[PDB]
Amino acid sequence: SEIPQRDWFPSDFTFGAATSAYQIEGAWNEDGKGESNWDHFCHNHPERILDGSNSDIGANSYHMYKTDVRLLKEMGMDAYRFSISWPRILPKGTKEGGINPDGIKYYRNLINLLLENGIEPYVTIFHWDVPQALEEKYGGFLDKSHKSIVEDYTYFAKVCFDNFGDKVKNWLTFNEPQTFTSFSYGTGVFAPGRCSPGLDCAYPTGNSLVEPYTAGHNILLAHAEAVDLYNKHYKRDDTRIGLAFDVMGRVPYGTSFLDKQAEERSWDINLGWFLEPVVRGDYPFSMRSLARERLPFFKDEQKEKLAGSYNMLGLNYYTSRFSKNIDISPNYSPVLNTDDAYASQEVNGPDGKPIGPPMGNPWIYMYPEGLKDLLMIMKNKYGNPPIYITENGIGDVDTKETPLPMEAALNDYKRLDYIQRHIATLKESIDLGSNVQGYFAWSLLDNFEWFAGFTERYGIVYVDRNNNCTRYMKESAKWLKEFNTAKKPSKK
Amino acid sequence: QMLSPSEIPQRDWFPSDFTFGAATSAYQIEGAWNEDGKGESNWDHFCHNHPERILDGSNSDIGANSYHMYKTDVRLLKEMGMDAYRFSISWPRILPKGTKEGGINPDGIKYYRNLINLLLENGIEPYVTIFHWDVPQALEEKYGGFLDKSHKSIVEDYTYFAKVCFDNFGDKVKNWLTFNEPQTFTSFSYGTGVFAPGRCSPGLDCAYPTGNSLVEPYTAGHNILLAHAEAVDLYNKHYKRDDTRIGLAFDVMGRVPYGTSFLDKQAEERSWDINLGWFLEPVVRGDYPFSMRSLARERLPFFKDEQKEKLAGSYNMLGLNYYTSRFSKNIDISPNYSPVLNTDDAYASQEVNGPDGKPIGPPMGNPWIYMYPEGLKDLLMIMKNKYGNPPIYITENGIGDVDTKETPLPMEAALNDYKRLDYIQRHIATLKESIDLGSNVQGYFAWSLLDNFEWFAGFTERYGIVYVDRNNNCTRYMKESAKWLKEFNT
């Protein structure tokens, strides 16, 4: 059968689940934790969240992590990817502000419990939760000096290396810098909600063509400094560090050679943006030729620290899009930073049919082939470095007007089928030379899905918010459980 | 060097309808530069006023004296069994003042009709290049020729010259090429300035460093495209017959990524674009390559919709002048780098020697030709897979034997041109390989039926398959290459 079996993959292969701090933790202002950009955004603009909710409680994992670890254990996961709340560790976001003991202890307890149970931690240092104190001091990642945020982020990473480096062997400095920059300062659907005048976001007094690039540049400088620090004082033979990129596969809209060029520019604007800098030390050629002065140059010293600043890389894959060419002409001018790719990303092809089957929410269309394309690109174009699919899954719609019955939410067969197909694609990719080494289902738990609030459940484990956030294994989780039971069965 | 007799191309390797011929250009072989009322050209002017810009300080006042010896040229073509002969028309020989009001020169019309008729008499099909770099000096002084900032005068004057050609030769000519190597013409004439009028950007070494190597080449190229579009429109609407065809020929050097980095693949891409796509894409889809627009920006003119419409599909066939290839190496956009020449807009260095230190192919003698037939195959695959697999003619292919005063080439050695024969045989063989791969190539023209004036190289290079003794009344002598071609076609 083509249904994935654990013996399809090497003994060393890794299978886990993933979450992020703001999305599952709760205890937003408990035990000294400082306010983050998201606490601020949700509390100030509930109307910018689909269901007007916030993650004050989320999945209450700050108090229920032991149940989280138990389920991970029961499912036989090899690893668990989670993030550290910058403001829970440093309430004022700086060294000056001081470290929060309860924050350090929370993560220390989680990490130790995971390891004791034989589950390897894959820690995301920054998963979009910027301490509000930094946002107010210098705009956080919008820091025009390119110094303040780099120093503050670097110290944050230092505190993580100092307090957890003896137990953590896998680090991810940043999660989806492209989504973060483009959504936060481009379309403004993410905190702080900035965008160009004329666009519909909470603060249409920004610049979608510039701020996303300013933020991205500071993120890359911060990543380079943190990795430099790591390699000089905390690096160990068995530890790895990198970052995770959000990536949607790209496929030519039509047959014209122009759509092939459009496709290339789209991989560039989405993946290339942050990938090429850590691979070779600079932005993709296409981006420098189109964004021009809006895309900052790197000093030679920065280019050096940037090139090769990873031991592994994560890819968060969910869907794909058809790329359609847009010619450079006097009748076209970019509005969003993503418009600099001179191509429109389409869900539907020229025949009026979606690239793949819709999975339920507004943007996820199933197209496993896209993942294979992505892996072949990493293999053939970017040196075939160690790759971990740090995120993959779907969100089941559940709203007040369209309630999702718990029994139906638990019988998540679409998610199961989707997960199985992507794991199968990983096997096909491996048989073609891909250096992929692990897979993480996104959302061990149903959680706060940013601007979607609680309208989408991505968990393999159901969280009953109506009843003390009690957890319930869904069919997907149960299949993963049997899948992980043994590396190599006997009889699959 | 020169291998296996079982590899030697045979005529039956190609379809009965395939076309094999030789090629020349007006200024290079005609001579009679000011005879029978012929007007002065940009090249007459350049060679006369700037002999130091020509390797041996020569000029083509006589060339191969084909204006008078064309009957012998036809004879040789006939003897070699050539199916066709590609030659060009001298704009100034037809229109001394390059304009309609300047009048048509009856002696010019006569000359070409005699050549064309004699060719057809001997069963040789004429392939006529309308413009082969010889602009009437009168137009150059009037508004700068293709530098016309109005983008109207030159288009009108060229369209009229084209009309005179269609009117007076269209009855016998069924194969037209509007322009020869537009990229070479624009870049060399206004970029590096090695070609007449010899303009370049201030601070650069050329006869007239008062131009702009980042704009003039594009202005000229833009006018050339508008001129081509107009001429083609005119042709289709008044001269096009079911059995006649029109197009143009592009100069093309193959491009191979320098190293294994994906960056060199992209550099190779931009290079094919700046060299070939610059003029190919406009005639294929009505606009310049995306890469060029993203890099040259406003230095690359926009087309009016009416023009994009006339440009798109303005050809029934396409010519490719192929001689060698280069390794393309990436150059990043940065505050430390600034383009100087229009060709620098491609952000890539063109290298002869690869990362292993070996030349892309064996040197053929002159300073730039390295034998790499595989590059021709790469080119035909691109044409087939990316640009609609249109009918293709290799309108130029060959090598130039160095023959200077310092190091004179013994005539006997000049005639035993085995290196050229080898090169010719290998590229023809490559056409057979490309055909088996789906290429829609329909013909091959060895460049230089005769040793001629090789532009800034003067007479230091002999590209002919037929030797021309300029010392003894420009007498012609068959070289080994010609003798093999004779056998090939028989």
Curated annotation (Swiss-Prot), chain A:
The keyword Disulfide bond applies. This is 4-hydroxy-7-methoxy-3-oxo-3,4-dihydro-2H-1,4-benzoxazin-2-yl glucoside beta-D-glucosidase 1, chloroplastic. GO terms for molecular function: beta-glucosidase activity; cellulose 1,4-beta-cellobiosidase activity; DIMBOA glucoside beta-D-glucosidase activity; fucosidase activity; galactosidase activity; mannosidase activity; xylanase activity. GO terms for cellular component: chloroplast. It comes from Zea mays. GO terms for biological process: carbohydrate metabolic process; cytokinin-activated signaling pathway. Residues 256-292, 325-336, 381-384 are annotated as: Dimerization. It catalyses: Hydrolysis of terminal, non-reducing beta-D-glucosyl residues with release of beta-D-glucose; DIMBOA beta-D-glucoside + H2O = DIMBOA + D-glucose; DIBOA beta-D-glucoside + H2O = DIBOA + D-glucose. InterPro entries: Glyco_hydro_1 (IPR001360), Glyco_hydro_1_AS (IPR018120), Glyco_hydro_1_N_CS (IPR033132), Glycoside_hydrolase_SF (IPR017853). PROSITE patterns: GLYCOSYL_HYDROL_F1_1 (PS00572), GLYCOSYL_HYDROL_F1_2 (PS00653). Optimum pH is 5.8. PANTHER family: 4-HYDROXY-7-METHOXY-3-OXO-3,4-DIHYDRO-2H-1,4-BENZOXAZIN-2-YL GLUCOSIDE BETA-D-GLUCOSIDASE 1, CHLOROPLASTIC, GLYCOSYL HYDROLASE.
